[PDB]
Amino acid sequence: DIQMTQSPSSLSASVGDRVTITCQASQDISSYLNWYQQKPGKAPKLLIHAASSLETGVPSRFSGSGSGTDFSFTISSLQPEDLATYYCQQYDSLPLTFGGGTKVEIKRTVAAPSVFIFPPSDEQLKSGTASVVCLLNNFYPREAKVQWKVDNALQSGNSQESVTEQDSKDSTYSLSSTLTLSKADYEKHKVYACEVTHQGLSSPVTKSFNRG
Amino acid sequence: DIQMTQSPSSLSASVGDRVTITCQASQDISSYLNWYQQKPGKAPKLLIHAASSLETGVPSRFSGSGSGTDFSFTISSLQPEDLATYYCQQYDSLPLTFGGGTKVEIKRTVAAPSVFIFPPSDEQLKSGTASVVCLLNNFYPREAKVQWKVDNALQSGNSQESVTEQDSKDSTYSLSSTLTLSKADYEKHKVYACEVTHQGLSSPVTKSFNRG
């Protein structure tokens, strides 16, 4: 088939920066190339058709060019809402093939995570499990550490965390750590602590509560 | 343009099950529909072209049916290699619209969400806007439904959700539903509720707060 080679695999640039992504077809595909934008968790959206025709409704900062084997896509000045994975697709023939994609990540200033800790719900305890939740809100970069301490003893392999994709409004992340103990182990202890270390934190922040 | 609506948005199933997704167009598009498969972090792959033409190389457990406005896709026996997100796309005319997608995932121990509700801070209300958040935490499968009620009335068109994509999928989700109201509207009501639904919950868990 026609192989589509996209580059780079991912990249980070500041808002206002020009972004250029390229695609090459294994063979001359004339001008039959489309560019899609895939926001996190959404269906892909067409931005550019036939190598350079900008779809109506798409911001003018997007543009494509080239023909034959080499093609390129450009974002004049990167904005928070451009956070997505861009794909090029050749439509010279079936099977319509896509390139690997390119994750663009917005670089921005360091933001300190504002943190909260939430004790298990009595309704949750009734199921045989207690989940203590620790929330790290609006931070940058993503590299953040969250260590659990139950009665001063460090925890391991009983924590699970979900971090969000970079926010399209302010380019920050939010993370949620969850300590899961059986109702028995939970009742055996009093102090539940969550130690969050981040780059915008001079010293590790510790949130905690005393069991009822 | 032509709007494509898929169904369901996600589904959990065990290896060997017969799976069926649907896709309906806002207007007759003949057989001009493609069905893609997208593994996490991969570019979509065309599986079916022209409504029911299996692309050379795809396994026969995959089938397509439909014409005009109602289409469907079927997997005779779900195989572990089929766990992914599927899309339909119409190519009757630009902008080559893609449906929302249907995430097909494996059945596992049902994990119920611990919902939390956060009211707007005074600093934000200063801005003239009011956003009340409702976090669904650490759940599974992804199928969940957050419903907002203000002074016991059902709201619509004023909330936004962002599901945390799970990376290394022997995991769980987190979902935020943000209801934005103008300051004046926010101060015109008392009770703000968020009623979530999930298969882990025996009954819809309604979480709320009273302005004040």
Domain residues of chain A, as ranges? 1-107, 108-211
User: Residue A92, SS3?
Assistant: coil
Contact map slice: B 35-54 vs A, CB within 8 A: 42-46, 49
Which of these, B38, B7, B2, lies nearest to B22 by C-alpha position? B7
Instruction: Kindly report the number of other CB atoms within 10 A of residue B190's CB atom.
Output: 13
Amino acid at A135: L
Which of these, B81, B84, B51, B76, lies nearest to B66 by C-alpha position? B51
Amino acid at A169: K
Q: Which two tokens stand for residue A113?
A: 């995570």
Bridge partner list, A66 = A71
| Within this chain, domains A1-107 and A108-211 share the same CATH topology | yes
DSSP-derived secondary structure letter, A199:
T
**Chain B residues touching residue A55 (CB < 8 angstroms):** 94-95
Q: How would you class B128 by CB atoms within 10 Å of its CB: exposed for 0-12, middle for 13-18, buried for 19 or more?
A: exposed
Please indicate whether, in this complex, the C-beta atoms of B138 and A160 are within 8 angstroms of each other. Answer: yes
- Please tell me the distance from the alpha carbon of residue B144 to that of residue B136, in angstroms, as a whole number: 9
Q: Is B124 left (phi over 0), alpha (psi -120 to 50) or beta?
A: alpha
User: Residue A80, SS3?
Assistant: helix
Query: How does DSSP assign B94-160, residue by residue?
Result: TT--B---EEEEE----B--EEEEEPPPHHHHHTTEEEEEEEEEEEBSS--EEEEEETTEE--SSEE
Amino acid at B78: L
The alpha carbon dihedral of A34, A35, A39, A41 has a sign of: positive
Which residue in A40, A97, A162 is closest to B172 by CB distance? A162
Q: How would you class B14 by CB atoms within 10 Å of its CB: exposed for 0-12, middle for 13-18, buried for 19 or more?
A: exposed
Query: How does DSSP assign B40-51, residue by residue?
Result: TTS--EEEEETT
Q: Which two tokens stand for residue B39?
A: 């593994």
Residues present in chain B in total: 212
**Chain B residues touching residue A100 (CB < 8 angstroms):** 43
Amino acid at B83: L
Which of these, A86, A72, A65, A70, lies nearest to A29 by C-alpha position? A70
CA distance B25 to chain A (A): 15
Residue written as token pair 């596992």 = B108
CA distances from B61 to A147, B19, B32, B105 (A): 45, 10, 21, 17
Contact A138/A111 with Cβ under 8 angstroms? Answer: yes
Q: Which two tokens stand for residue B43?
A: 């570019």
Residue written as token pair 């200033």 = A109
- Please tell me the distance from the alpha carbon of residue A192 to that of residue A189, in angstroms, as a whole number: 8
- Please tell me the distance from the alpha carbon of residue A13 to that of residue A107, in angstroms, as a whole number: 5
Query: How does DSSP assign A122-162, residue by residue?
Result: HHHHTTTEEEEEEEEEEEBSS-EEEEEEETTEE--SSEEEE
User: Residue B181, SS3?
Assistant: strand
Please indicate whether, in this complex, the C-beta atoms of A41 and B163 are within 8 angstroms of each other. Answer: yes
Contact A50/A29 with Cβ under 8 angstroms? Answer: no
Amino acid at B44: P
Give Cβ neighbours of residue A3 (< 8 Å, ≥ 6 apart).
A25, A26, A97
User: Residue B196, SS3?
Assistant: strand
B201 contact A CB<8A? no
Q: What fold is seen in the domain A108-211? A: Immunoglobulin-like (2.60.40)
Give Cβ neighbours of residue A128 (< 8 Å, ≥ 6 apart).
A182, A183
Q: What fold is seen in the domain B1-107? A: Immunoglobulin-like (2.60.40)
Residues present in chain A in total: 212
Q: Which two tokens stand for residue A8?
A: 């780079």
B80 phi/psi in degrees, rounded to 5: -50, -25
Which of these, B67, B50, B64, lies nearest to B21 by C-alpha position? B64
Amino acid at B70: D
Instruction: Kindly report the number of other CB atoms within 10 A of residue A36's CB atom.
Output: 23
H or E element: which one contains B184? helix B183-186
Extract long-range pairs of B125-129: CB within 8 Å, 24+ residues apart.
Answer: B125/B183, B125/B186, B128/B182, B128/B183, B129/B180, B129/B181, B129/B182, B129/B183
Which of these, B183, B203, B205, lies nearest to B194 by C-alpha position? B205
- Please tell me the distance from the alpha carbon of residue B18 to that of residue B79, in angstroms, as a whole number: 10
Which of these, A3, A4, A16, A19, lies nearest to A84 by C-alpha position? A19
- Please tell me the distance from the alpha carbon of residue B212 to that of residue B209, in angstroms, as a whole number: 8
